[PDB]
Design a binder for this molecule. Structure first.
Ligand SMILES: NC(=O)c1ccc[n+]([C@@H]2O[C@H](COP(=O)([O-])OP(=O)(O)OC[C@H]3O[C@@H](n4cnc5c(N)ncnc54)[C@H](O)[C@@H]3O)[C@@H](O)[C@H]2O)c1
Ligand SMILES: NC(=O)c1ccc[n+]([C@@H]2O[C@H](COP(=O)([O-])OP(=O)(O)OC[C@H]3O[C@@H](n4cnc5c(N)ncnc54)[C@H](O)[C@@H]3O)[C@@H](O)[C@H]2O)c1
Lengths: 336, 336
């Protein structure tokens, strides 16, 4: 039972709000779209189809009723354009900012466009939200910001040195958000995601994340590569936990705002064990090589979620094995 | 005497280099242009005249030889456009990046514009220098990076939270510089200026700095406003010290690179004391209200410069009194 979350959702259904989702055609964005429409919220969506896809939007349309779909206004546009940022803010209550170009490798190889997308784009959205006087503002941050801090588990208040331009951009989102609270009274929540996974995470392309990447290859009978020794470890966190945290953040009490929260489950899985896990789960629905470490890549990652548990009454319910199980059927349909 | 600096300056007279100065039409940039052309260097300049002035360029031209001036290539353009950054970099040995929009209050009113010049702008120049593989890269950082840290005097390795949008941008300069060193081997030096003053520091404009502002007001007989009770203190730094630190950094040994240095005197002067000192030196060339503290003002500011003295052989040889004596005639001229 996700008790607090249950209750917040009940409020929303009775007293529906207008939400903006940037990144809405992407993985986490379209997941948020799915749930909010299912709660009868009015949603305004913004995406430029860079890493996101029209087919994410089409899938969501099939997952929700037609009255629900009718409360969704999609706007093709770019967060790098302040003007489009302000137009989409008009009448918004709740901001959920997911639009970014992710990936640590991407940032190393083009820190320029990524800076414009992830810093300039974020400030555009942040400033426009302030001027529009939204009720809340919750944005996607990153565990990569811990950097080279050696402590496990990772606690919000203790971070190291950024090890990639991607880490920098996400850290900058946090600092601008803090200064926005100091300078304007504008109180936000930043969510440091830890390896999110589930339905509609892109398996294709040179920047694919490890779970969909491997799943896709296992299905195709292709090779399953591992960047380094396989001991590199992570806190894989199924999207539903992320959707919970975004919605709790949006209706957080004021004292819980201007804070950063780890979003994860608190577990550690190595890349060796995951390789196993995905195979076992895919083999139930009836169907290995080592290379060099990825540069700018973080060694070990495990979240401490006590802070979100405490302040938001976050209840992480779906762990890695279950979440794989919920996902593999999605990837079969999608890749066939 | 300025032993190491004097040594360096003689070397340059004998074996000229190509220097890029961004912000070349500004206060610090045009002072750097003056010194480098007097040392017969090849200088590439870039400025968009946002806060800079064509007349600073005209002034520098009257102070050097036509042959010296023939080695100044001036480009009117914006560090926000990467292409123009890449162009001004070809054949450059030493980058002195000074272009930015200063002023805390400016950045509160318009955080978007400060962001674009100070972070996007800075990152474009840093990336192009990296790509052109220059010998050195030195940038204007800021004492605002100390934020709310309570130590005084201020020591490079101990900083607090950034207290305005401007402070975020200057802090982010440092972070990107450190990330470029880790990621691409590209070692920069960042210079945390404290309260620089001297010739060609704009006395006009809403964001005018205190020494020039007060000096204009004294000569016109306008009201000298003190923002608070006058015990507020600063480490006022004559330009020539800053010129010094720039050139030392440009030619620093490798191990002195990827480091941050305070650039100041190490002394603390009150606003009360300063209003005295300005008057005193103005009246030797023969010619006061109290209001609210400015919002978000720093109470006391003083640098510890031993790291500069130690690693770069800096000599803070011009103190506030001397510097004010040297600057007062320039202001009398400029203002009549
Ligand atoms: N998936 C993870 O494990 C993870 C981890 C840490 C942080 N994040 C962050 O979560 C957020 C959402 O990530 P995701 O995993 O859904 O990736 P994703 O690539 O599916 O979605 C990102 C979406 O943002 C859109 N977008 C990108 N730049 C845009 C721009 N300039 N203007 C408008 N839209 C733009 C893309 O088209 C895409 O739809 C991003 O900020 C990402 O950095 C994700
Ligand atoms: N003066 C101080 O006490 C002090 C203190 C801390 C930091 N700084 C920093 O020192 C540097 C130089 O400052 P200054 O005091 O000479 O200020 P300044 O305003 O006199 O000069 C800055 C120059 O940069 C140029 N510029 C601004 N944006 C530009 C852009 N996008 N493209 C091209 N040119 C652009 C302006 O036209 C101007 O000529 C700045 O980085 C400033 O933030 C100064």
């Amino acid at each position: 039972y996700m008790s607090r979350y249950e209750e917040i959702t009940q409020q929303l259904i009775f007293s529906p709000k207008t939400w903006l989702i940037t990144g809405v055609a992407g993985f986490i964005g379209s997941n948020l779209l799915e749930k909010l429409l299912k709660l009868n919220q009015v949603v305004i969506g913004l995406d430029n189809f860079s890493t996101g896809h029209q087919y994410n939007l089409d899938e969501v349309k099939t997952l929700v009723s037609t009255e629900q779909w009718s409360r969704f206004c999609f706007i093709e546009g770019d967060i790098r354009d302040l003007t489009t940022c302000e137009q989409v803010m008009k009448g918004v209550d709740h901001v959920l900012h997911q639009a970014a170009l992710g990936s640590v490798p991407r940032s190393i190889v083009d820190p320029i466009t990524t800076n414009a997308t992830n810093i300039t784009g974020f400030l555009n959205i942040l400033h426009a939200a302030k001027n529009a006087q939204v009720q809340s503002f919750t944005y996607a941050a990153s565990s990569s910001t811990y950097g080279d801090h050696p402590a496990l588990p990772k606690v919000e208040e203790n971070i190291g040195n950024p090890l990639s331009p991607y880490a920098v951009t996400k850290y900058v989102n946090e600092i601008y958000a803090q200064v926005y609270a100091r300078t304007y009274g504008f109180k936000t929540i930043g969510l440091r995601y830890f390896n999110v996974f589930g339905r509609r995470q892109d398996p294709n392309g040179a920047y694919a994340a490890v779970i969909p990447k491997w799943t896709a290859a296992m299905l195709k009978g292709d090779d399953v590569y591992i960047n380094g020794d396989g001991e590199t470890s992570r806190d894989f966190c199924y999207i539903d936990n992320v959707i919970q945290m975004n919605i709790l953040s949006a209706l957080a009490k004021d004292s819980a705002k201007d804070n950063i929260y780890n979003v994860a489950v608190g577990d550690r899985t190595t890349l060796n064990e995951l390789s196993g896990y995905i195979y076992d789960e895919l083999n139930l629905i009836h169907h290995i090589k080592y290379r060099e470490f990825r540069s700018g890549d973080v060694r070990h990652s495990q979240a401490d979620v006590t802070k979100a548990i405490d302040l938001l009454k976050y209840r992480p319910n779906i762990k890695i094995r279950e979440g794989l199980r919920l996902s593999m059927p999605w990837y079969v349909r999608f890749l066939k």
